[PDB]
Every structure is written in C-alpha cells, then in structure tokens.
Design a protein around this ligand. Sequence first.
Ligand SMILES: Cc1ncc(-c2ccc(Nc3cc4c(cn3)cc(-c3cnn(C)c3)n4C(=O)OC(C)C)cc2)n1C
Length: 262
Amino acid sequence: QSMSVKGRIYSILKQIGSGGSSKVFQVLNEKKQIYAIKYVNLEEADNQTLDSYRNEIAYLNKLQQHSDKIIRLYDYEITDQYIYMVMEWGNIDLNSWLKKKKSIDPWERKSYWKNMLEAVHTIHQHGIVHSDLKPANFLIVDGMLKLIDFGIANQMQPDDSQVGTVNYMPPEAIKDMKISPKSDVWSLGCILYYMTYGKTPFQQIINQISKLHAIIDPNHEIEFPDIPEKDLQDVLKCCLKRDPKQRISIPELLAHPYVQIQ
Ligand SMILES: Cc1ncc(-c2ccc(Nc3cc4c(cn3)cc(-c3cnn(C)c3)n4C(=O)OC(C)C)cc2)n1C
C-alpha cells in the first residue's frame, strides 16, 4: 500500500497509531527517507471538527519557524474528504518510553525537562494553553523531546478508545465548574514527578472521584521524598502549588538552577 502527497509517492511500512477518523503511518519516500504520515478521514466530520484540524495544522505550520521542539511538518494535502500530513519520524512517544524504563538517568531527565519547557513556552507565546498535557504528547526524535499536539484536535494512541487520565489535571480546572499558562506548569510538574519518583502525585488513589477531590484539597499534602538533586526537589515543589498565582511560571523555570546548572 502507498499514498501520494503533493505529487510525492510514499510507501507504507506500518500503522504507528490511530484515533477517531485518523491513522498515523511509518512511511518511506522515493529516496527511502522515513516519515510519519497522519491520514484523517473527513467524510463524517462536522464544522467544529474541521476547524479543530485546520487550527492544529495552522499552529504546526506557524510554530515550525519558532522552535525545533515542535514536531516538523514537511508537507500536507487537504481536500473535502481527507487530510495527509507529512511529518518527521520519531523513535517512540515519552509515555511508551516511561513504561519500558526501569529507572531514568538524571542527565536524560534534565535534558527531557528542558525540551518540554521550550516546546510549552513556544505555544504559550502564541497564545495557546494546551490544558491536556501528558507524556504521550511528547515524542523522542534523535535524543530530543518534541511536542506533537496542541490540545486542539483528536489524540492518537499507539498501535482502548475510552482510555483517559486525570493524573496530570491541574486543580484550577476541576475547581472551575481559571485555566492559564500556569495550568500547563502543573501538568509538566506531574510529568517530572513521574520521571523522578516513578509515580504521579495522586496515582495511589483508586477512585477517579476521590482523585479529583485530592487534586483540589489543600489539606492533601503531596509527598516529596528526599533525593540527591536538591534543585530537582525544589522544581517539583514550585510546579505543584495548588494556587496558580503561587505556582512558578515557565520563564522562571527556564532560569532555575536545575535547567541551567549541571
Ligand atoms: C511501544 C510503542 N508504542 C507506540 C510507539 C511509537 C513508535 C513510533 C512513533 N513515532 C512517531 C509518532 C508520531 C509522529 C512521528 N513519529 C507524528 C505523530 C503525529 C500525529 N499527529 N501529529 C500532529 C503528529 N505521531 C503520533 O501521533 O504518534 C502517536 C501514535 C503516538 C510513535 C510511537 N512505540 C515505540
């Protein structure tokens, strides 16, 4: 099986992932260069869903020139029936990687954290608040993490369609029933906490309702066990402040000893 994008032919090696009416493929061009092609079937898509895909593509296109920590979009084809998006190929998403790993190297953790801060800082500068950050939103491309979605369109699962997670959800979002660039700091904080302690802050709470209650309860103290990297411990405490006004910002996190000193 093959496909054509803007007069260029690509052969399909396999399906990497899926989600809703979209499929992600590992492909080769004519020079045998590897790419990821996202195919989106638009036949049963409404105006709200069309706008979400148009907005994602537009932000991907714009942000290319602003940071190398956003996945490269090389070409695309858009009609009334489908979307083809030609992107750079990555080895694995951060979530599948964190599942394989028994323990993480402190230097790899630090490098990954800096990439995540740079990618998220760039989207904030263009007025995007992701609000749904989790490790699966990051892709490893040549020892570097790259953001692959903006929380604007449908999420891809590597190849259960009910699968979600409340584990990275900021308290203000739950309370508001508010969401600012600070909301993404809390989610990045939960990812770093996972990379440090091997669990997310509220993972042990079984019931999802009890979990949401724990996220917003100031009386529920998050445990921060003593570790050799005192700067890392400090980053974690600053990110996971329940009050977003008290919570550290991304420009401040980029000037922190943990990211700048090694
Ligand atoms: C164990 C395991 N499960 C899944 C994987 C795995 C393997 C390879 C990849 N590589 C990969 C995935 C990619 C892309 C480029 N490379 C681009 C995308 C993409 C889709 N939409 N947008 C805007 C970008 N992408 C993607 O969505 O991957 C999903 C399946 C995790 C991603 C995940 N692995 C290694």
